[PDB]
Amino acid sequence: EKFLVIAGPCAIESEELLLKVGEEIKRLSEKFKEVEFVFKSSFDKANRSSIHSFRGHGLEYGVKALRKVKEEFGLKITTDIHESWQAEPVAEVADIIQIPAFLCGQTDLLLAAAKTGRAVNVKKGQFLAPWDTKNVVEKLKFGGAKEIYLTERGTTFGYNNLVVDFRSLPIMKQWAKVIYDATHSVQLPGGGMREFIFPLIRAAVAVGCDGVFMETHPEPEKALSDASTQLPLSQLEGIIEAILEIREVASKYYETI
Amino acid sequence: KFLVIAGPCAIESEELLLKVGEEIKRLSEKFKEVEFVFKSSFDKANRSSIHSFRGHGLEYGVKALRKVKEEFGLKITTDIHESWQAEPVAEVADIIQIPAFLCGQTDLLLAAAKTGRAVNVKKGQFLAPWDTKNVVEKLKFGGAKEIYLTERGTTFGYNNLVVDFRSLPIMKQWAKVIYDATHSVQLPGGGMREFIFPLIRAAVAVGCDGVFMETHPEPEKALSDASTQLPLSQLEGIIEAILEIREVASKYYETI
Amino acid sequence: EKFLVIAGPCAIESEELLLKVGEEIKRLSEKFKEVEFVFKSSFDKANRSSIHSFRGHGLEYGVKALRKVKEEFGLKITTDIHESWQAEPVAEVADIIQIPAFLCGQTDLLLAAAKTGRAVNVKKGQFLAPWDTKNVVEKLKFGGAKEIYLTERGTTFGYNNLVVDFRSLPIMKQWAKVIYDATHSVQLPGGGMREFIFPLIRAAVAVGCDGVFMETHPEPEKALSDASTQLPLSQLEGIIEAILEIREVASKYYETI
Amino acid sequence: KFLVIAGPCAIESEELLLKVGEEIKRLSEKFKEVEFVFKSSFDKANRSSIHSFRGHGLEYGVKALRKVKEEFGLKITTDIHESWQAEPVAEVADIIQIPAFLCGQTDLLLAAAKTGRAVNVKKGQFLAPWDTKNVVEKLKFGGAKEIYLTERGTTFGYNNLVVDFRSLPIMKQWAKVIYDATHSVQLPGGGMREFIFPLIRAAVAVGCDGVFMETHPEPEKALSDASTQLPLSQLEGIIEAILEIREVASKYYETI
Ligand SMILES: O=C[C@H](O)[C@H](O)[C@H](O)COP(=O)(O)O
Ligand SMILES: O=C[C@H](O)[C@H](O)[C@H](O)COP(=O)(O)O
Ligand SMILES: O=C(O)[C@@H](CO)OP(=O)(O)O
Ligand SMILES: O=C(O)[C@@H](CO)OP(=O)(O)O
Ligand SMILES: O=C(O)[C@@H](CO)OP(=O)(O)O
Ligand SMILES: O=C(O)[C@@H](CO)OP(=O)(O)O
């Protein structure tokens, strides 16, 4: 099947930053034809730690910038929603509606996403066991979702730390396509983070998944969010080529679910 | 004074909210040194199954709660799930409750703060104690003045929660701490019930400004949390017990 | 029943330090007649993090110092063993043989302790669930132990941190007397530690237990081990009086196991 | 070269150690680029139940192992539980294995180091990756030169272990890292077996210097770890698979 790569800057800092990253993603999509790229960026960071942290430029502006990207590079789009009412307007540009980790259980948000007709990607909450995502998918199908994804982004392990229990990839795969989030899984809520992105991502594809999610920024050192975990845009190509290779050599061993 | 939030988990009917309210009213008259607050949810926004009981709606819920505050003169508290519900609920709710999973949703918090009412934030299972400082700050920025942080357990492996009592003195540095004696023993997704009382005792021995307890006339027949909701008849004894322990232990509560 | 208080310096730094702390424990035993005091001190720290850390003055010396304490103050004694062969010599002075947390599963060490005829106290391993201590007790009875204790000392919660799941006190109580270790439960393997000793200890007695364990040192700031967690000897009396009070008011509510 | 430690969990009989050794010998001849090490315990020192199988003893165990090293010329590794067993075992064992629960017992480590042999320390379920630095240092102080650290999972709530693959590159800073593919999926005190292969693949994709696998002709009839021991017939395929993944992935292993 076709491997999915979801990438983009964490936050829509500006419509300019978006086109910049979009161009590189467009170039990679032309080189890696066996991959399905999806451009990602949040129009709003609805749960920053501090009130003084960057949030976004609004739903209207964000949807507008995301549309420019889709229009100029012909790339699929995905963004996340935080409240039911955002589902409809967001579905006008987003091919995949993403549900935040903390909200993976909110029945109304799930239902709002499902009826749009768009694909849905749920970030598995840090508090959720892998086998309990089964009902999250049941809710979505009930609400009309035909294209569903579950994203592994780590589990709470003590305070201010997340661990990736790779046993979850084959478990969640029983009821949905699985995406490994290479960026948030090494984050420390509130390991040295960055140095582990690449090795864990190798593990993901060795275990087996249907796609990976990576927040990439031209200059992570200057991002308005996830500055310490966003992958430098120049390294994106290398990471991709590498996971496609590992995936290929490992794939014949992938178990049938 | 010492806070005691109690009531049925979900608003199964205005009828139920009145029967439990009656008993709460009676305890209210018996323990003048305790400030009772009636709690009940007009909607279970995150039931595991789509096929579970959510409720009769926000309008019907606010109607029943209003009936309780009128027929018994008891303060009210209910939880909101989306920003738009902060205003309509603040009409009957003396304290707006922020669900544990949503403790980080800035918009939901700012909306709660805007109604001028008191706000009680449930500490997320994924959140470290010291990280609640930022939750309170967001509320102060939004104009909140009476702010409560409630301990309801922390993610411990899969389908399990542990109560790290160190969190009580830690959160107390920036808010009034409430201990949720009911959701702290439930297994997400021990024998639950048998641990409710023992842990409540630990909570007051350590030191907290209040306790949260879901009670139902017939837990077995409850439409939500039927295994962790305390039988109404047992509420009096547990309150009396926590006041006595508090009386003796309070002598040793460390200074913020 | 009679509440048990196990206290003493973490390590037998010197026979002098032992008599110093022993004197205070002797004085407290005379005041708190409803309490059963047991003097504790390890003749060896068999698992320090670094190789350059203090260990002890040997089994022979330690047993000798512990005997002086028992001889001069008439106090019961307890110390821990790390290998089967130490059981016999140690039982000649120890009223209670203690089994280290990491070794709570070592069948031979348990059996060696059990046949001495002395009482046995097992520190519940940081990796052990409360309901799995049931077999640790089964092993001891099999080996001849008639007086058995289980000590709560925290559970692994992420890296370098322990949490106390008080649900364990009523669980382990189903098959043994339970002791709450007020000192090691707030330690950070490899919370601010000290500031939590007293509140958690209050929780323990409120929940209900048969005794508490507290490492106390005249000058914690100078101890050779557990310097940041050992309680100052001058505060011992206050802590005890407080837990006896909380215990009394709470006891009528203790559930029957 | 890449290390592969395999064999039956416990020494059920010299007979069993020879049948598994034969197959290991054959794989040894088939994969010249891999260094096979025969592993088996002469005693299960910490079985949950007193009524479980421990073994036939140290003498009988060292006798069977010796038979394997002679009849097949395969390196040997077994685990020691108390200091006094370091010397007698170092007679047949090329690598002395330190049990996970005992990774911090200074005397057991110094004794293992004294025999001059290679030492493989199992990282305790309670130990943080970076805290293994001290374990290696104790061994160097005791004269150890060939030191291995084995990842076997970390305590995650109750009766469960999780494998934090970040630990591999971290421990690699001060030792050769081995991945225990068998005990990492067992539930202390998921479906275990089904996760053994997937996680082994992750281990080599990340980068490790070797793998540890317990194998038994008939796992179902094994006297220890009958649910997590890999069927002998499957060993060849998994090895071939990890060599292929390694070949491709090794290009990206980060530098220590
Ligand atoms: O849902 C989003 C994540 O948890 C973010 O990446 C989050 O905003 C990180 O928090 P901080 O505000 O501390 O950067
Ligand atoms: O078993 C003993 C404990 O774990 C000690 O209190 C331990 O020695 C603490 O370690 P450190 O060597 O780092 O002080
Ligand atoms: O990926 C992200 O930007 C958001 C979700 O849309 O973060 P999280 O997955 O933690 O909810
Ligand atoms: O108390 C409750 O009914 C809800 C929140 O309103 O549960 P939790 O505290 O876990 O979010
Ligand atoms: O109490 C102690 O000195 C030792 C055990 O004898 O430490 P731990 O309980 O951690 O094993
Ligand atoms: O490998 C094994 O048989 C034993 C150690 O010798 O188990 P663990 O690694 O968990 O200690």
Kindly summarize this structure in a few lines.
Four copies of one chain form a homotetramer. With 257 residues, chain A is an alpha/beta fold.
Q: What are its keywords?
A:
KDO8P_synthase (chains A, C), binds 2-phosphoglyceric acid, TIM Barrel, EC 2.5.1.55 (chains A, C), 8-stranded parallel barrel, homotetramer
Structure, described:
4 copies of one chain form a homotetramer. Chain A has 257 residues and is of the alpha/beta class. The first copy, chain A, has one domain: Aldolase class I (TIM Barrel). Helices cover 33% and strands 19% of the residues of chain A. Chain A has 8 helices and 11 strands. In chain A, strands 1-2-3-4-5-6-9-10 form an 8-stranded parallel β-barrel, surrounded by 6 helices. In chain A, strands 7-8 form a two-stranded antiparallel sheet. In chain A, strand 3, helix 3 and strand 4 (96-99) form a beta-alpha-beta unit. In chain A, helix 1 packs parallel to helix 2 (59-73), helix 4 packs across helix 5 (134-142) and helix 7 runs parallel beside helix 8 (236-251). The first copy, chain A, is globular. The interface between A and B is large, with 36 and 35 residues. Bound molecules: ribose-5-phosphate (2 copies) and 2-phosphoglyceric acid (2PG) (4 copies). It is classed as transferase. Keywords: KDO8PS, kdsa, catalysis, loops, transferase. It forms a tetrameric assembly.
